Design a protein around this ligand. Structure first.
Ligand SMILES: CCCCCCCCCCCCCCCC(=O)O
Length: 392
């Protein structure tokens, strides 16, 4: 299992087949994206020798999951017959501060959420009663606690999980088809991101997500609650696969979210790249380019299908009164918010105080941006949605 002889996407495949002990796969869709990633980790000089191995190791594990899910479905065709109806899906720009709602929806026992451990070890699926106590989940929690090296180091802002097994993004299902925006944050250039947004056919990916969800439902049934910012970008393919999707559009100051995006990228850049070869001023234009797709893709879809197909969740409303937003979400989704559930939601908020709404200078200077430069990108967006800014 070494990345010395990994030159092509097929080599990555062999390793994944080696590790998982499986060799059959559902299609060829995974190859195009993985080939772009591999070509870059091999050729780009910005990568640390370690960084290269890290990216290839993650790709291998991701592809291995794809292999594991395919073997399972073949042995359990019936899972494909059970529908995934009216999934609750949160989309929009990244850095909108949606974390709270994901956890609150997870408090409803009739609703299912995608937990991070299910994006690491999906097969075999667990029962509802054990979604948070399954040994694979516990093991993940323990080796997470088993990396708390007090070696005078802070950490690495991403202990993905929170409490015992929490909601995660569909991004970690999607990257298994190598058509997910997360891979781009591990790449020095924007070739992969431009391919993804302007060329990649996203159908294979969303079709894969549905199968994935059908496998998790088979042992732990319920109505799905999903999230992933770039669902906004790929909203057309999403609708194709989940035509009945109840879309929750998450909003927040676009200027703030943009600078926050650029900042978010620093962590993966520092984990696998020689940061001195990077230009943070150039990261600003990429973030700007990416944000444009995050607002226009869904804006066009909304113009076509109607505002009523969406629920608008504002960051400022989520801070001042989340419980109010929940009741309105439930009314809108026309579903009863039981007292038991409302209590769990309140109990969660009590134990998880949220950062008060505050206004500070965004300052995209650090990334070569200005509100004046971003204004045209979000002009329509800010004009159609009443967003409370956190500027100056
Ligand atoms: C817009 C993000 C949608 C997916 C949400 C799960 C995490 C994906 C990556 C988060 C950063 C999104 C912005 C682009 C980052 C990149 O270029 O990789």
């Amino acid at each position: 299992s070494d990345f010395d002889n990994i030159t092509t996407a097929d080599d990555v495949f062999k390793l994944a087949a080696q590790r998982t002990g499986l060799s059959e796969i559902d299609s060829d869709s995974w190859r195009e994206g993985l080939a772009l990633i591999v070509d870059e980790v091999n050729t780009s000089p910005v990568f640390t020798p370690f960084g290269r191995q890290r990216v290839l190791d993650d790709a291998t594990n991701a592809l291995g999951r794809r292999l594991q899910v395919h073997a399972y479905i073949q042995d359990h065709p019936e899972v494909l017959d059970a529908p995934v109806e009216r999934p609750l899906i949160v989309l929009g720009m990244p850095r909108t501060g949606t974390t709270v709602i994901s956890y609150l929806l997870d408090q409803d026992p009739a609703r299912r959420s995608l937990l991070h451990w299910q994006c690491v070890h999906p097969i075999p699926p667990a029962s509802t009663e054990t979604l948070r106590t399954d040994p694979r989940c516990l093991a993940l929690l323990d080796e997470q606690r088993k990396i708390l090296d007090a070696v005078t180091r802070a950490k690495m802002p991403l202990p993905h999980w929170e409490d015992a097994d929490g909601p995660t993004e569909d991004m970690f299902i999607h990257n298994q088809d190598f058509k997910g925006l997360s891979w781009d944050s591990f790449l020095p250039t924007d070739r992969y991101a431009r391919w993804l947004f302007d060329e990649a056919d996203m159908s294979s990916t969303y079709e894969y997500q549905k199968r994935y969800l059908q496998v998790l439902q088979s042992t732990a049934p319920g109505s799905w609650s999903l999230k992933m910012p770039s669902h906004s970008v790929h909203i057309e393919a999403l609708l194709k696969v989940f035509p009945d999707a109840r879309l929750i559009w998450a909003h927040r100051d676009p200027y703030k979210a943009t600078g926050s995006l650029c900042n978010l990228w620093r962590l993966p850049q520092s984990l696998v790249m020689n940061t001195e070869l990077l230009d943070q001023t150039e990261m600003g234009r990429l973030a700007m380019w990416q944000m444009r797709y995050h607002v226009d893709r869904p804006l066009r879809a909304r113009e076509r299908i109607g505002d009523e197909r969406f629920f608008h969740m504002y960051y400022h409303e989520m801070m001042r009164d989340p419980m109010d937003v929940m009741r309105r979400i439930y009314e809108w989704a026309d579903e009863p918010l039981t007292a038991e559930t409302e209590a769990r939601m309140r109990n969660w908020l009590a134990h998880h105080p949220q950062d008060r709404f505050a206004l500070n200078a965004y300052r995209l200077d650090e990334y070569g941006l200005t509100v004046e430069a971003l204004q045209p990108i979000f002009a329509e967006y800010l004009d159609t949605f009443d967003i409370e800014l956190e500027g100056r």
